[PDB]
């Protein structure tokens, strides 16, 4: 990552005569200093720590995530066939809770913002979290028939929000210049996305219904029966689905062996549509612009069970390779295909808080695969957590220091004395500024048996830092 310290006054212009540049990290995150020990270079440069979040919405998001973490209490790691759901069911409830929390964060960011790149990173993290919850946070390792209503509702969500290919700019390109092939590509792209209402609506928009009445009726009836069929699509039960796909296959067979009173290309645009709905693997893969459109189709219309996922993704990856433009595609691709180790780094490139708590709830679900605190444990979740805690300690936001101290006190790694050492070394740097806040410091000193730091902090409070004011009121 290459960032300019100042996009205004660059102190070095030429390559020759290199100047001794000096830099010092400040006790506060967003206030570090740089300078130059050279003639005619007497400017001080405040360079805030790169890629950071100082907004109040971020602090409320971290407060909410730490509440859910403390709310989740004692869960670490537990296939198996014994006892009950325990953490499993509870873990999912917690997963959809943090997903709601991340969405509220993204909403408050889109409202008050100056840079939108943070909004882009958060939405990429939300897309990966949607994929993760769809893949391992609904069925609890089982199949789709167990709980079809929830699974699809999440899948149709994860696809819909993920990309932005279905948009007003794209449709108008094809809506402005039925006969054209592109129309059917977009219709099948809508179908592969479960965007039923959009597809049906475009129908009215589409040239065909009156014209079908004008031409072969039968086909027109048929197309109307297929429009009706998509309105009556069942999401609640797999048994209802079984009849549904049976009906679509009977309709596709009946039309394939029927009268051809239309154009060859129109006959050749209706059979596809019927067979994409039927779930034939070729043309789900044909009219797919990306791989997740393919994967969404195979889950939707061929077989709705989780098992053939390994196959589906492979076939989809044989149609449209992983788009490296964004940072969520390969993660989701890896997430679907078992491997989860690779995605934790990429999400840490997006947001450290989201990535840390993601690794936390993943360990909580299990999903796995010399005695420092900053050292790897089972799944390096303590790393993600304790490092995010250490990162927060420098942020200078006193509303988040309780989060950091709590997150360290809740680490499964490290002795009681290891956390005692950490608190003893970290607590003096706490930005106490109000007279009622020091009760928190003294209570923690009592809680972790550090009375020496308690009295050493009251000495600094002594005389308000040696009579550093006049009135020196409570506020």
């Amino acid at each position, epitope marked *: 990552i290459l960032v300019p310290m100042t996009v205004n006054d660059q102190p070095i212009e030429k390559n020759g005569d290199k100047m001794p540049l000096k830099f010092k990290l400040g006790p506060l995150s967003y206030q570090n200093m740089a300078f130059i020990t050279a003639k005619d270079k007497y400017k001080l440069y405040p360079v805030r720590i790169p890629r950071l979040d100082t907004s109040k919405e971020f602090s409320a998001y971290v407060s909410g995530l730490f509440e859910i973490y403390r709310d989740l209490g004692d869960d670490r790691v537990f296939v198996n066939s014994n006892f009950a759901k325990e953490h499993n069911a509870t873990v999912n409830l917690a997963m959809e809770a943090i997903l709601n929390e991340l969405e509220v964060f993204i909403g408050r960011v889109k409202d008050q913002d100056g840079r939108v790149n943070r909004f882009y990173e958060l939405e990429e993290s939300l897309t990966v979290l949607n994929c993760l919850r769809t893949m391992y946070f609904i069925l609890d390792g089982q199949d789709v028939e167990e709980n079809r209503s929830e699974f699809i509702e999440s899948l149709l969500n994860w696809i819909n929000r993920s990309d932005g290919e279905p948009d007003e700019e794209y449709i108008e390109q094809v809506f402005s210049v039925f006969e054209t092939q592109y129309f059917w590509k977009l219709l099948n792209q809508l179908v592969l996305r479960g965007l039923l209402s959009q597809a049906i609506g475009c129908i009215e928009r589409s040239d065909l219904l009156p014209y079908l009445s004008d031409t072969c009726a039968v086909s027109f009836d048929a197309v109307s029966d297929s429009i009706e069929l998509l309105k009556q699509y069942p999401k609640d039960s797999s048994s209802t689905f079984r009849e549904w796909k049976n009906l679509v296959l009977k309709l596709s067979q009946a039309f394939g062996s029927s009268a051809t009173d239309i154009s060859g290309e129109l006959r*050749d645009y209706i059979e596809d549509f019927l067979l994409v709905i039927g779930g*034939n693997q*070729r*043309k789900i*893969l044909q009219y797919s612009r990306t791989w997740y459109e393919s994967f969404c189709g195979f889950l939707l219309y061929y077989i709705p069970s989780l098992e053939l996922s390994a196959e589906y993704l492979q*076939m989809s990856l*044989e*149609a449209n390779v992983v788009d490296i433009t964004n940072d969520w595609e390969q993660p989701c691709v890896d997430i679907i295909s078992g491997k989860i180790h690779s995605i934790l780094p990429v999400m840490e490139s997006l947001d450290s808080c989201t990535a840390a708590f993601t690794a936390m709830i993943c360990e909580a679900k299990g999903l796995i695969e010399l005695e420092d605190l900053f050292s790897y444990r089972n799944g390096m979740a303590s790393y993600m957590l304790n490092s995010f805690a250490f990162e927060l300690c420098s942020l200078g936001d006193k509303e988040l220091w309780p989060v950091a101290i709590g997150l360290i006190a809740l680490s499964a790694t490290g002795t009681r004395s290891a956390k005692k050492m950490v608190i003893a070394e970290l607590l003096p740097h706490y930005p106490f500024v109000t007279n009622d806040d020091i009760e928190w410091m003294l209570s923690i000193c009592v809680e972790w048996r550090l009375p020496e730091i308690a009295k050493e902090i009251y000495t600094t409070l002594g005389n308000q830092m040696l009579s550093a004011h006049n009135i020196i009121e409570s506020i």
Partner: nanobody
Amino acid sequence: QVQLVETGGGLVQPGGSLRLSCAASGFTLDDYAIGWFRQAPGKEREGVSCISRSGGSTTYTDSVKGRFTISRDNAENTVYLQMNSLKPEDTAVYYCAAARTRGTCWLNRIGMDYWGKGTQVTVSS
């Protein structure tokens, strides 16, 4: 009695373009071997392009990859071969090849004996 008619051939200059078209009967589901082959004068017939899956993928030969483009109309017995950046190495008689129905069956009676009648594609130097 089904047929395989093809058109679009002709005589063009090096670096020019041509568009080959072909039609057929049955074209029933997948398991296809349907595609363009070519035969140079005196040489043996080599495969140019072929639609393996129904839009899932394509099989090109290594002398036309990046220049030729094959497309098929969905679930239909037609093919188009767009020949861009034609060179004197593409001078041949091109043939449309296919399969009447699509079942694993047994390896006997490949379609019908009449394939494509041929269209002459020659690119000068």
